[PDB]
Amino acid sequence: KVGSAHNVRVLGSGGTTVVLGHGFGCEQSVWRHLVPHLVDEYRVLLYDVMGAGSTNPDYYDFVRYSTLEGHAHDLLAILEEFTIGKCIFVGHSLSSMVGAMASIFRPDLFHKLVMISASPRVLNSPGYHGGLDQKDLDQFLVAMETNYKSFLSGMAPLVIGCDSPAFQEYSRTLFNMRPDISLSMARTINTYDMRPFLGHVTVPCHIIYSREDPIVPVKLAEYLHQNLGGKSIVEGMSTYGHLPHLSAPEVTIPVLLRHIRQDIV
Amino acid sequence: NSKVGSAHNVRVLGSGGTTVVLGHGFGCEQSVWRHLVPHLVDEYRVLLYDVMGAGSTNPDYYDFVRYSTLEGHAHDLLAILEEFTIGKCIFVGHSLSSMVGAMASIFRPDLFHKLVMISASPRVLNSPGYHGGLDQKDLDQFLVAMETNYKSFLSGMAPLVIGCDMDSPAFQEYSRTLFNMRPDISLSMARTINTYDMRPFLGHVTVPCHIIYSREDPIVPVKLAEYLHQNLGGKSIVEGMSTYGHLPHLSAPEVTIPVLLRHIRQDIVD
Ligand SMILES: [Cl-]
Ligand SMILES: [Cl-]
Predict the structure, then answer these.
(1) Does the active-site annotation cover A4?
(2) Which of A241, A31, A19 minimizes the C-alpha distance to A117?
(3) Edge-to-edge strand list for the sheet holding B209-216
(4) What share of chain A is helix, strand, coil (3-state, %, to 5)?
């Protein structure tokens, strides 16, 4: 039931499983440049976040997935059913914080977290620059609801940092979502706040960021580094855009492989 | 039953569309609610469950890092609510479970109509501007004794915490579940309950909270009820009871149950 609802796919073999969680507007196919480098050494688990176009719209509970917790409980259900022991969790954007929260609920299931383009909170706050003002978020959400296809055609190039073979792939999965579900997920990712809980994350975290992410300010990597409760390490990449694992896999995948295989300290 | 249901001995009783969820405190099991349940079943669905680590649960399911935080237990509560409820529950939590429920309501406020807290404390330790009631040196020596002479520590602790006669049914019930716990797990839970700090999280709680306290609670200063009242992020109300002990829902049900029923049935204005 859980494996079908999330298109769970297991590849490779080994005593350690690597779990890959995609971000908004993507599907598990976004990891295609990474999986072949891992299967010979690791078991690799792929899954789709509920609400992706590849998933059944009947399973999208709008109240449950108005919160980050609903996606975290989905991840935990996937790990309990399909893994054993501790896994290496890799998560881009939304799924990086999904995994952060899931590791507080079940630290006994994670060896480490590898975060790509991670942000504990997008909205600006008195002493915190997430990169987005509340009144701008409201305008983006209204614009997304009224002129859906026009909004996505302008946003996704900016998010990839492009426009244009680099963003065609992201466009395919982004428009695969149903507009009402896409709008609900966009609100959840732009309104969660993981700041109060970072100090209770105890598993090692590898913080990977794009040095020119339009959604994620560079200083947030340092913010995460300073406020996570356990050990962490930070590495920046000379990439442009919010999805470096898709637009620039020749630079991003070697970085991911290094932080997956090597442990802090 | 379900995986989460069997792990926590989930039991569902009562009748009607609104569900009252009862979460017990340290050293108790769901049988601590013996006097409240029969006053609810003709009007409310009642969900009972055991906190992981209680003697009635499987020791193999208790991971010491997992349950070293309130989030670990709140995850279990959220799993239980998502599985056995579809509406907004009325959560009644004693001591440990009052903060578990508060923490759970931060992740999913949509699942809670209100929180009814019994003997609640956001932090036991004293700090420069905050009187939790216990100094660090006392906690350290309690935890050492709890590890060095565990049964001797428990035998001296139980009658003082429940504060009632040892020839009473309240002490028998409490002593049974307290000694039912596995010692290493008991020490783990005691370390968690005496080291969590909910003060930074109170402002993020937004569901209505009813703060019920025992005026002579040997564990919880009366003043903390007002501290919770001042610092919770949503509506809250305070009511004290002329009872003696930390577990008045078990030791003084004639006083406590009428108070709980009123706060379960009435919203915060009433
Ligand atoms: Cl995202
Ligand atoms: Cl307790």
Answers:
(1) no
(2) A241
(3) B11-14, B45-48, B19-23, B89-94, B112-118, B209-216, B236-244
(4) 45, 20, 35
Residue A217: both structure tokens together = 């300010």
For residue A131, CA distances in Å to A124, A178, A206 come to: 6, 27, 22
Contact A133, A123 (CB under 8 A): yes
CA distances B184 to A109, B71, B143, Å, are 21, 20, 11
Please identify which residue in the block is written with the tokens 């949503």. Answer: B234
What resolution, expressed in A, was reported for this entry?
Answer: 2.3
Q: Find tokens 């080994």 and name the residue.
A: A14
Cβ atoms of residues B174 and B95 within 8 Å:
no
Residue type, B195: T
Q: How many CB atoms lie within 10 A of CB A40?
A: 9
**Beta strand extents in chain B (DSSP E only):** 11-14, 19-23, 45-48, 89-94, 112-118, 209-216, 236-244
Q: Using alpha carbons, select from A128, A103, A119, A126 the residue that is nearest to residue A231.
A: A103
Q: How far apart are CA A21 and CA A35, in angstroms?
A: 12
Read off the tokens for A120. 């504990």
Q: Tell me the one-letter amino acid at A163.
A: D
| Residue type (1 letter), A259 | H
Residue A104 C-alpha, separation from nearest chain B C-alpha, in angstroms: 7
Q: Which residues have a Cβ under 8 Å from the Cβ of B144 and sit 6 or more positions away?
A: none
What's the CA-to-centroid distance between B99 and ligand 2, angstroms? Answer: 9
């794009």: which residue's tokens?
A: A210
CA distance B104 to chain A (A): 10
Catalytic entry in A213, A245, A247, A259: A213
Nearest to B66 among A68, A108, A196 (CB): A108
Give DSSP secondary structure letters for B144-173: HHHHHSHHHHHHHHHHHHH-S-TTSHHHHH
Write down the experimental method used for this entry: X-ray
Of A198, A196, A230, A33, the C-alpha closest to A125 is A196
Q: What six digits make up the tokens of A200?
A: 């209770």
Q: In the beta sheet, which residues pair with residue A37?
A: none
Where residue A12 falls (left for φ over 0; alpha for ψ -120 to 50; beta otherwise) is left
Find all residues with CB under 8 Å of B32, minimum gap 6, and list them.
B24, B25, B94, B173, B174, B177, B247, B249, B250
